[PDB]
Amino acid sequence: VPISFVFNRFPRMVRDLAKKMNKEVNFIMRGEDTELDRTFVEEIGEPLLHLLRNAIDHGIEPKEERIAKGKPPIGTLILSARHEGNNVVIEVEDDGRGIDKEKIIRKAIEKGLIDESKAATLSDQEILNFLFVPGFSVGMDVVKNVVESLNGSISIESEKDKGTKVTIRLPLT
């Protein structure tokens, strides 16, 4: 079916959470007519909701902070779907504060997941993928678990003060 069956739930959720946290969010949905198999439609809402909540809570900064940082005052959250060959690609993008990669590394060292000696040459993907480790810092492990139950993949791109883009890829069947 069309992914609108999932996406149409989100403006109310986004608006309620933004209100609760006294933030202003410009929420844009694209590609809502993208069709995919019912099994995906039935399961993908929960992970997407988690990612949207992360963007509103942890990503987009309060207006006053954005102004102080010389950013546009209202944060933008874009949820998109598209076909790419045999895959459907779903992206959740915010222009908030980004994920703090140094914080991740420090936590990974604390937890014994990496030796300090290996931190300097870690790739960006290797750093951000620590967020999918169970217990790391209801977590992102559960997002990845659902995506993988759908034979999908997930990746994160993020830069300090720029924002965060989470990409889910799903197969045709």
Ligand SMILES: Nc1ncc2ccc(-c3cnn[nH]3)cc2n1
């Ligand atoms: N969209 C967005 N923006 C900033 C974030 C900051 C931290 C986290 C996170 C930490 N531990 N698990 N997730 C997720 C974020 N997601």
